């Protein structure tokens, strides 16, 4: 009986950011096994799942992980101990029952992801095969083109800039390899100007710079002279530009209006859902954009559905909040035709089976669906292996500075090296939810 | 080493129908084992890949393969011989290679399927696991809704009907074990009928009936009959209908017209294609009709746009010989708004490799891909593993009667006895290119 | 204790025809495997084994095998398990107890069978040798000469014909290979004639036609034709004919007499058994025949000893109903001079210990035995094993088109194939109850 | 022959920072697996060991490492396959004598140690044990105490402070794991007091803050502020605070003076060597200093002197530019009494065999051995296995913000759980060069 589990354990670790997180282990008979650690998020006032904290401030401020650790150890260990490596989705599904609430409070969503990774993971150990193989079959083939953060607003800056983070695509080049190079070539431009102009060059959370920048659109065009100093073009036979908005913050529920007097000065505007829409237009028509998160309130569906008829057929739009990788309210945008692109977070739903789910379904209806990191991150390296398991793309996997971002490029790296000439790399031919 | 082929071998054997095919063998170094045998199908005048034969007339009328044996045994063999059995891209795009034409026509699709088949068999022996979780990863959970022949006409029959052939699907039914029972219920009490009238009860190719009607409105009154003499209901919550034109075998080349008087008698009608769009229309109308098969001819481009735009968003149409199962062709009709399906048929293309590619392409697209069967078949069950192995929610293999059928229906009683509690049938869920 | 069972399973299945039927597992401790599924047949008033069938009209019209399986699943297994997987008639010994009625009635035949058949190919793949090298010992090495069906009657026909199938042989051929592809162009031959005579050219359940003749000597002339249109000789020589007339039908016990009127019209005769002996030795001066399969009632012995005076230095003389496989009625039959050759069908009799018994008593008494299949059938190949393991000479397995009838002849050309320059093929020197 | 290196292979990856490294892998026989990647740092004006580097302006800024990836693929693989993997003497002491220059610039230095720690990690895999056990045999048992990074200065800040860097140590602390969570309690409540003063919050290449304070007293006094605010003592109790001069940068080497000017007002001090120790006493008088590294000019032997007769039973006295980590170097400041510490960089030397001579030539002469890091890095944790398999009871490896600092923190909670009850932490007790 080589394949059954004979034990599952857990202990308390740090992120990135230095805050307390979860990690769990796997064993088999044959001495086969797996480590799974979950990185860090948590949310109130929505229908995503929850974590488990400790609330006792004597340790580290209340956040620590012990009631997760005592749940592995003490309850889910007991029921999944004699189970086969192999059954994924009998066990993730056991789990589910385990748990018995809607949104995985009496477990936490924290403890049951970390099972459920460290499983997979022990399970392509005693097969075998490397993990995007196991996950995906045998077409498992193409490398994503990366979405990658280098400029810093609103919440995040104390600059007189409205959106969240500003980003560079490296669509025309003709591999995977070359543009991580033409990446890492515009992140050194950049530096050398802000240097030059007298500018803080330190960085934040997802290891991109947040200057006192005059106002959204100098961010903008200092983006484009550094693409240019660097010696590419702007523009589809090159590299393009995308914003996160993330719109739900500035917007005035009592008013029913967006106003950019929070982020921006006592001068600034307010605007309607038709002004935001006009807004986001002009925007469009004078730089090279290629795609929109967010730019629209989580709950202005009218919106979304104005919004999708004026600029879906040019640009993407992506859910993010308005989703939270959830199917239920998937299945009414699809229907409604709000929106042609998702991003997937594997923490806010908790298990690998329902992650694989949703993609399926979104890409049925013809959309997009890129895989992202949060912000406090992990040595983890496990979602480069699902955006290549499923053939899916794009990936949202942050700036090139620190080693929580790094590591996952150096995975991507050693994958492109493996598949050699079965190896494909799509550029601008990545967008079917465009191109229609 | 143990995971190295070792030795690939190749024989002559029968079809049903009593033809001469092919088959093959392959091993590992460990003793892992598979055997491949290729459906008999070739046609003229569109660019399917093309079967090696024997011209010799002495033998078999000329429909001899031993020819195509010989080059899998003194070329393809030690070519292969040396690579790992997990491997499956790789060797496939050897061989396509090694041969070095378009059509695949100096070595034999035949031949390049035979070995292509074989070696996934080895594969899922080598790592002691079922066809469907090494073909499509751990995420394999869905039955496909079976659509199944009854009754024939057009150049399958003598009566006066133009259409080749009618389908029944169980679309109301909670388990596919309930569906099968269903389907052999309402093929009994058809029997039953046609024997008090008089009719013929011996049986075609698919093992369906093909008796003397009068006309096509006989033909579908007589199925409607059986429906509640079963005790089932017609429509979406129970029993729906469906055709098969092959509308290229009356279709005028030269008139540009589609003319009847082919297969009905002398005084039926002579339709242009907005005539064409008018009678369909007027049976759907009238019937409990679901889907479609190659309604326009091959080349009537024009006219799959106005059957698309009139009928599209009702009722599923199917491309098969608009598509051939090319990539080229599907590729066009996407640009174009000209269907909303394939039909796909393995041993048209020649690889498992390009399979796979054109079910993907269909689902970005919002297409349903239907996996399909020939006329000659044999004792094989892989298309059953396809159908599960992608999640594709339908299946077309043929009638209620002839072991060359019962063989590809048993399989799948089988994969829902082992997924269990996990396992899925949608019922009209399935078209998720209309209910939008 | 690699070789001990560790469990054995049945489910539910179909058969050719749409009807349920059963399937059965086993398994070793060391992970050795065996299927074995059951052809279909019943009988009543007679000394054959009997099957279950659930009679519950609410599904499959009462014909399910349901109780079959809950004693397979509730009571063999549990008796089973801890046999070594080789005591093949120890274990068939302790089911007939365990039963313990003369005919199986309380488990059911079918149920037992099953079990009988998965054990011996379970114990094959643990010793690692070919099916017929388990069951024969290493004299394995005739390939069995066929008698295929091409045209039906009596009960099987709308035609004004008594006798219910007709077959050919092709006794001439140099090989087994070469033989398969004599039977094969004849087929192809006839069907040609019919479509020039305006005739049906569809099939039945053992795959052959049934054309409305004018009589039993068109019947008989159109098959000749058929023969000369291919290019070969009819007698010795070439290919000749055989009948099984099923005589038991057209019997009438209360006149003592047989009556044509029943399949043919108000003008055909009345014959006694004396003018039955001389009717069919009028057909033996005619025509190539070489066989002939009943030809009087299950109980005119009296008539069976006239009979096999008259003509059993001459021709072959076969019984089916009237021995039933059963020992007993053998015995009395070898004892009274009443047959030269018997029928095999597993599943009337129930294990293969009693099948393996019954040919070994046929042989010494110097008559001929004949391996059948059933109307109904499985993708199972086992009975063209037992033909080679035996080295019996002669197999009864249909016609040239359908998958349950072709799958037995592809088996054998694997066979001749192993067994390379040690096979052998005896043609008309097969027939050692004449040529004595 | 299981033990035997049939294979090693090199890549090109990047570190942190986001630039070019490299990347080994070697393999058993056995199918034993290791995998090594090396930090990137080089200097210049010193006997530090030469890294290779592709001289070409258009990658990467002339930063590319194809050259030395091509000296292992092409030299040193052919050099070291068929060795046993257990051998590191001879291995390392083999690449030495191949590359045959004192400052290994033949082959380069980062080529060779990439083969040097990869070796080590299949070893400890093929004998099934811990890395820490398999370095340093069966008595490890002393977790390190950490001096972690908090504030900046000199020329890694634009504040006007000459000094490079300020560290916290918690040597009042029973367990490690209550050390970490002393220093992230503190990390926090810094962060409170910066935001409350109107400073940035941003973090430099090791993940501590840099803002513009008015000079050294400041920063001083606002980490004590701190340590009051989460609630420990400063002194031996509780927390200890530590200096790192890079002094060389502002010493003037044709004056012979220490020169404040240059990262400090136009009216600061010019200092003579006497006065230098003066100023440093005059620090430590004040403040709980426990540590100073880099005190004194790399050149000035005499000022060495002077600041050792003065200071050095009070306080550690740490070599790191003054020794390289060079046994030439060390031995003369044994001799001469010039220091009571060594900082010891791994990829200085170039083999783990010369790493551990001159760690135990330091244990000889009554001085601390102290592992560190370099600038850029990578999210390999080898140097927290080198620190338990020595006994030696100090690391310098960073803040607690960066996964490239936070996963060589997350590897010594790993070891404390598992060496258990048999676990130490010294604290205070570990400057055995002191409190004598």
Redesign the interface.
Request: charged letters at 35%.
């Given at each position: 009986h080589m394949s059954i589990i004979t034990d599952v354990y857990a202990?308390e670790?740090?992120?990135?950011?230095?805050n307390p997180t979860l990690e769990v282990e796997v064993y088999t008979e044959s001495g086969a096994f797996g480590r799974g650690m979950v990185p860090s998020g948590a949310s109130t006032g929505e229908h995503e799942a929850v974590e488990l904290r400790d609330g006792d401030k004597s340790?580290?401020?209340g956040l620590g992980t012990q009631k997760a650790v005592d749940n592995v150890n003490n309850i889910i260990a007991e029921a999944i101990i004699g189970y086969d490596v192999?059954d994924?989705?009998?066990i993730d599904?056991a789990m589910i029952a385990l748990d018995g609430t809607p949104n995985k409070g009496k477990l936490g969503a924290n403890a049951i992801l970390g099972v459920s990774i460290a499983v997979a993971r022990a399970a392509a150990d005693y097969?075998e095969?490397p993990l995007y193989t196991?996950?995906?079959?045998?077409?498992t083939?193409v490398l994503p083109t990366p979405m990658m953060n280098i400029i810093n607003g609103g919440s995040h800056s104390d600059a007189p800039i409205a959106f969240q983070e500003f980003m560079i695509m490296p669509v025309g080049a003709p591999t995977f390899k070359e543009g991580?190079?033409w990446g890492?070539?515009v992140?050194?431009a950049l530096k050398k100007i802000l240097k030059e102009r007298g500018l803080?060059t330190?960085?934040?959370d997802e290891g991109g710079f947040?200057p006192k920048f005059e106002g959204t659109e100098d961010g903008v065009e200092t983006i484009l002279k550094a693409i240019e100093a660097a010696g590419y073009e702007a523009g589809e036979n090159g590299i393009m530009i995308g914003f996160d908005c993330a719109s739900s913050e500035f917007y005035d529920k009592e008013r029913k209006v967006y106003d950019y007097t929070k982020f921006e000065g006592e001068g600034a505007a307010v605007r309607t859902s038709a002004e935001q829409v006009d807004y986001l237009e002009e925007l469009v028509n004078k730089y090279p954009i290629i795609t929109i998160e967010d730019g629209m309130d989580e709950n202005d569906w009218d919106g979304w559905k104005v919004l999708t008829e004026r600029l879906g057929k040019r640009v993407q739009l992506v859910g993010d909040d308005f989703f939270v990788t959830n199917t239920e309210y998937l299945a009414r945008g699809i229907?409604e035709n709000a929106a042609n692109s998702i991003l997937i977070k594997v923490n806010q739903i908790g298990t690998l089976?329902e992650t694989?789910?949703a993609i399926?379904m979104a890409?049925?209806?013809?959309y997009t669906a890129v895989v992202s990191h949060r912000s406090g991150?992990?040595?983890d390296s496990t979602i480069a292996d699902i955006a290549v398991?499923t053939?899916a793309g794009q990936i949202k996997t942050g700036s090139?500075?620190?080693?929580?971002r790094?590591?996952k490029?150096?995975q991507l790296?050693?994958i492109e090296?493996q598949l050699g000439?079965?190896a494909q790399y799509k550029g601008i031919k990545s967008f079917?939810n465009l191109k229609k």
């Open positions: 202990r670790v740090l992120d990135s950011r230095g340790r580290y401020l192999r994924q989705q009998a599904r097969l095969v196991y996950l995906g079959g045998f077409n083939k991580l190079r890492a070539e992140f050194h803080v330190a960085v934040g947040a229907k089976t694989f789910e399926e890409k049925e209806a013809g991150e992990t040595e398991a053939n090139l500075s620190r080693t929580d790094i590591a490029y150096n790296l050693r090296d000439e079965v079917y």
